[PDB]
Each structure stands twice: as structure tokens, then as C-alpha cells.
């Protein structure tokens, strides 16, 4: 397989790891902060997906510094990863057009 497809897949694997690790660490960081909602695993994992996609529902968010750090890693992971998929798709389209052009 071509690099850009491997990378896509790799990123997917990397993203899912980040989501899991992140939701587990988020709960760890948040319990002990009064008023915190990011304190059970199930909804923390859902919070990971919201965060990495930037879906923006605003129903859960971290209030501690370390929870916020965790969140930044998940945003960047998500944004980069999905951006990588666009790159991978552009590489395919570009290769195809060279062919269709006789180049």
C-alpha cells in the first residue's frame, strides 16, 4: 500500500488510542475539582470524541489545568488526524489526474 493510505490508517489507530488514554486521564485529573462533570469513564470517552471532532455541543468540558492539557492533546490529535485524511485524499486525486492527463 501507498504511504498516504498507511498514514491514514495509522492516524486512525493513533486517534483511538488518544481518545481512550485521554478519557481515562481526564477523569483522573478532574475528580477532586468541585463542580467537575468530566468524572466518569463512559461520558469522558464521549467527551473525547466531541473534543477531537470539535463537534461543539458544549455539554462537557474540563475545569482543571491537567484536564485542559489532556483536552489540548485530543483536539490536536483529532484536528491533525482528520486533516491527514484530506491530505491522503488529495494525494489520490492528484495521482489520478496525472494518469488521466497522460503525465
Amino acid at each position, epitope marked *: 500500500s501507498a504511504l498516504h493510505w498507511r498514514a491514514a490508517g495509522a492516524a486512525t489507530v493513533l486517534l483511538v488510542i488518544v481518545l481512550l488514554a485521554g478519557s481515562y486521564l481526564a477523569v483522573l485529573a478532574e475528580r477532586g475539582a*468541585p*463542580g467537575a462533570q468530566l*468524572i466518569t469513564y463512559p461520558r469522558a470517552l464521549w467527551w473525547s470524541v466531541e473534543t477531537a471532532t470539535t463537534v461543539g455541543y458544549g455539554d462537557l468540558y474540563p475545569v482543571t489545568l491537567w484536564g485542559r492539557c489532556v483536552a489540548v492533546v485530543v483536539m490536536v490529535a483529532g484536528i491533525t488526524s482528520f486533516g491527514l485524511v484530506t491530505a491522503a485524499l488529495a494525494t489520490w486525486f492528484v495521482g489520478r489526474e496525472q494518469e488521466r492527463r497522460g503525465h
Partner: antibody, heavy 118, light 106 residues
Framework: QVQLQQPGAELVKPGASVKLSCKAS????????IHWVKQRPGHGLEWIGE????????NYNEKIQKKATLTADKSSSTAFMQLSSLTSEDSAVYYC???????????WGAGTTVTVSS | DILLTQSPAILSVSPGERVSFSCRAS??????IHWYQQRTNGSPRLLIK???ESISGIPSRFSGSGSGTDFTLSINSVESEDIANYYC?????????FGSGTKLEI
């Protein structure tokens, strides 16, 4: 089988300090939290604090005077609450419970009756 | 702390009747409420979780309802073994908290 094992009782002298134990069995997860709950005779339930043993991070009820220190021993899967400089105020049953990081106390220990007198 | 209010403290009903305990929360907590039974000398026993979800080993006649700030624990057809204290407990926000307790008597 029984999952949380606490000693039945502990006599303690004013000013002294006791270390209660809570011995776990059944499905362990590293995502498991152990909680400690205080019940004075007549009164209801009162959350004291929590620990995630597979990490040692403990959080405490900040609304009340801190008498407790939480620790665990990963190998014997036993959680220890260390109550110190006690007074009659601290005479109560102390339960420990287990939570799978989903917010509810599935199982509870049978409780340890800490009595504080000379 | 989220405050949970269980009022009245004592509920008195007749054998086989249906009974409802309420838990009111000081702010809105979805369905993150859990119900425990404690008989004289016993330790608490989880009856219902997340407002309405049943637990293995609990009689069918226990059920729960509510969301937000209003919650209800119901027993279809009360009977002697149900005589106990009943507590609610929230997991929406840290720390977890407990209701003051309601005692059922027949």
C-alpha cells in the same frame, strides 16, 4: 462470594489514630475506585474520600475536617484509611465501597465500627 | 456540593400499597442519580442506578423515574422486607453526594 472485607471493629483512644483496612476480591480493574463512607449511629451516609489504587491518587471530602489519609497496596488489593487524632465526634461505622468509575457503589463492605473512648 | 433533598424523612404506607420516595437535586443532573437500601444493621444495597436502570438481584417491584432535578423511587406492592432507610446519591459532579435518607414504615 464477599468482595470487600473490613474488620468488624476498632477501639481507639482520644488523640490516637487507627488504620482501617478494606480487602478486595472479584473482578479488579485498574479503572476501579474505592470509596469510604461514614455513618454515625442515627445519622445517614457521608462521603469521606476516594482512591484509585492502581495509581494511588486520592481525593477527599473538602466540606469536612480532614481526619483521613487514603492509601492502597496494589498487590494485596487492600485499601487503607488512616483516621488520626480522633475524638468522640469520629465514633461511627466506616464503610468502604467499590465504584467502576461510573458513579455508583455496586458493592459495599460490611463496615467497621470505630469506637473512641478510654 | 450538589445537595439532594429527600422529603419527607419518614413515609408510612399500608401493606401491598405502592409507595414513592422523592429525591430533589439542588441543580440539574440528568439521570445521574442512584438509589440504595439500608436495613437495620445492614450496609447499603444498590437498588436502582442512573434513575431507572434495574440491578440483578432486585425485585421487579422496585423502579425509578425522573431526570434533571426531580427523582422518584417506587415500590409496587410494599411488603415487610422493604422496611428500611432509602438514600439517593448523585454522580453528576464532584464530589458525589448523598440524600438525607427516607425511612419506610408499614
Amino acid at each position: 462470594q464477599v468482595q470487600l472485607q473490613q474488620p468488624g471493629a476498632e477501639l481507639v483512644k482520644p488523640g490516637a489514630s487507627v488504620k482501617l483496612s478494606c480487602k478486595a476480591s472479584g473482578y479488579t480493574f485498574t479503572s476501579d475506585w474505592i470509596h469510604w463512607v461514614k455513618q454515625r449511629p442515627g445519622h445517614g451516609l457521608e462521603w469521606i474520600g476516594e482512591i484509585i489504587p492502581s495509581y494511588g491518587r486520592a481525593n477527599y471530602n473538602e466540606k469536612i475536617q480532614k481526619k483521613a489519609t487514603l492509601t492502597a497496596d496494589k498487590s494485596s488489593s487492600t485499601a487503607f484509611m488512616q483516621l488520626s487524632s480522633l475524638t468522640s465526634e469520629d465514633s461511627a461505622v466506616y464503610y468502604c465501597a467499590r465504584e467502576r468509575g461510573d458513579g455508583y457503589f455496586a458493592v459495599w463492605g460490611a463496615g467497621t465500627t470505630v469506637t473512641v473512648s478510654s | 456540593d450538589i445537595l439532594l433533598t429527600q422529603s419527607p424523612a419518614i413515609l408510612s404506607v399500608s401493606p401491598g400499597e405502592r409507595v414513592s420516595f422523592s429525591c430533589r437535586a439542588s441543580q440539574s443532573i440528568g439521570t445521574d442519580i442512584h438509589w440504595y437500601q439500608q436495613r437495620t444493621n445492614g450496609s447499603p444495597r444498590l437498588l436502582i442506578k442512573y434513575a431507572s436502570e434495574s440491578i440483578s438481584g432486585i425485585p421487579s417491584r422496585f423502579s425509578g423515574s425522573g431526570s434533571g432535578t426531580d427523582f422518584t423511587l417506587s415500590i409496587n406492592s410494599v411488603e415487610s422486607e422493604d422496611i428500611a432507610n432509602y438514600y439517593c446519591q448523585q454522580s453528576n459532579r464532584w464530589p458525589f453526594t448523598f440524600g438525607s435518607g427516607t425511612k419506610l414504615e408499614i
